[PDB]
Amino acid sequence: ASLTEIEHLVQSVCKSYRETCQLRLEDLLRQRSNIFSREEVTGYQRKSMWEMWERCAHHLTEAIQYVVEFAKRLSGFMELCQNDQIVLLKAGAMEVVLVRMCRAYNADNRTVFFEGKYGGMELFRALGCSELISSIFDFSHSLSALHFSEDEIALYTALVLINAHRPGLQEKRKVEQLQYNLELAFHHHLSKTHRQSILAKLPPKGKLRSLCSQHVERLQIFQHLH
Numbered sequence: 001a002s003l004t005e006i007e008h009l010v011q012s013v014c015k016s017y018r019e020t021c022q023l024r025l026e027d028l029l030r031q032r033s034n035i036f037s038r039e040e041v042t043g044y045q046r047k048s049m050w051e052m053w054e055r056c057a058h059h060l061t062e063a064i065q066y067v068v069e070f071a072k073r074l075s076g077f078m079e080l081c082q083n084d085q086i087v088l089l090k091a092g093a094m095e096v097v098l099v100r101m102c103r104a105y106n107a108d109n110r111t112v113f114f115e116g117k118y119g120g121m122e123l124f125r126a127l128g129c130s131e132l133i134s135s136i137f138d139f140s141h142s143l144s145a146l147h148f149s150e151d152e153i154a155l156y157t158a159l160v161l162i163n164a165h166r167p168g169l170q171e172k173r174k175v176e177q178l179q180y181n182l183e184l185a186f187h188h189h190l191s192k193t194h195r196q197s198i199l200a201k202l203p204p205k206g207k208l209r210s211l212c213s214q215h216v217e218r219l220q221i222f223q224h225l226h
């Protein structure tokens with residue numbers, strides 16, 4: 001990959017992200033003052049776990065569908081074989097959704113955009129897993145301290161997905177090459193923007209992996225109990 005190729009790769013990732021970001025950053029920042037009232041929060045807390053799971057599962061289903069579309073518009077992802085495309089999506093799609101959340105997260109008051117307004121994590125009380133939820137909020141909080149640009153979140157989420165270490169890949173060397181190209185493209189774009197300092201501040205790879213382990217576990221328990 002040349003400099004033209006690395007620059008084209010950056011452009012491709014950023015364009016795909018912009019077209020698949022689901023919620024526009026401008027709309028999310030504008031809505032920060034639109035915050036659930038005490039009555040609306042109590043309204044959520046009184047809902048059954050069943051209904052709350054039904055709303056969350058719908059929210060997550062939609063978010064994952066945009067991530068699938070992100071992958072498919074990515075330079076190189078469609079060049080991979082079907083099996084590998086699926087292995088990567090299966091392992092990474094939800095990890096991308098967790099990362100994507102930080103944009104919809106307001107660190108000033110610790111709220112998230114959910115069903116039209118911002119609310120704290122207490123909104124989700126009826127689900128009965130406050131420790132996992134607070135870890136998700138904590139993760140979003142630490143990411144928001146980096147003030148990710150749109151292009152940065154584009155490149156970073158592309159790297160969460162294009163990971164050659166996922167078990168079950170049939171063309172490991174081809175995924176490696178795509179991964180290496182994205183790592184360099186990311187590093188290069190950060191230097192052009194004087195943002196190299198975020199590299200040392202990025203969460204350790206095991207952090208998102210360990211959070212997604214617990215997450216996918218609880219998700220599957222809700223999936224089966226339904």
Ligand SMILES: C[C@H](CCC(=O)O)[C@H]1CC[C@H]2[C@@H]3[C@H](O)C[C@@H]4C[C@H](O)CC[C@]4(C)[C@H]3C[C@H](O)[C@]12C
Binds near residue numbers: 220
């Ligand atoms: C594919 C992956 C791993 C499952 C496996 O061990 O094979 C699983 C675990 C968490 C799952 C998701 C979560 O349970 C949340 C959603 C629940 C809905 O009932 C289906 C879509 C939904 C968006 C799920 C899609 C998919 O089955 C996920 C992403």
Ligand SMILES: C[C@H](CCC(=O)O)[C@H]1CC[C@H]2[C@@H]3[C@H](O)C[C@@H]4C[C@H](O)CC[C@]4(C)[C@H]3C[C@H](O)[C@]12C
Binds near residue numbers: 061065068086090093
């Ligand atoms: C359950 C939901 C369908 C909702 C609907 O329209 O009724 C479907 C449609 C697209 C699905 C995803 C896509 O097919 C891509 C992935 C394919 C893998 O087989 C499972 C995980 C995977 C990440 C899927 C999870 C889930 O089952 C999704 C999100």
Ligand SMILES: CC(C)OC(=O)[C@H](C)N(C(=O)c1ccco1)c1c(Cl)cccc1Cl
Binds near residue numbers: 059133137
């Ligand atoms: C384990 C299941 C039952 O808990 C969730 O579903 C939680 C509520 N949840 C998430 O898990 C989530 C959000 C993004 C990725 O995962 C979520 C959050 Cl933390 C904020 C806004 C919207 C949602 Cl949907």
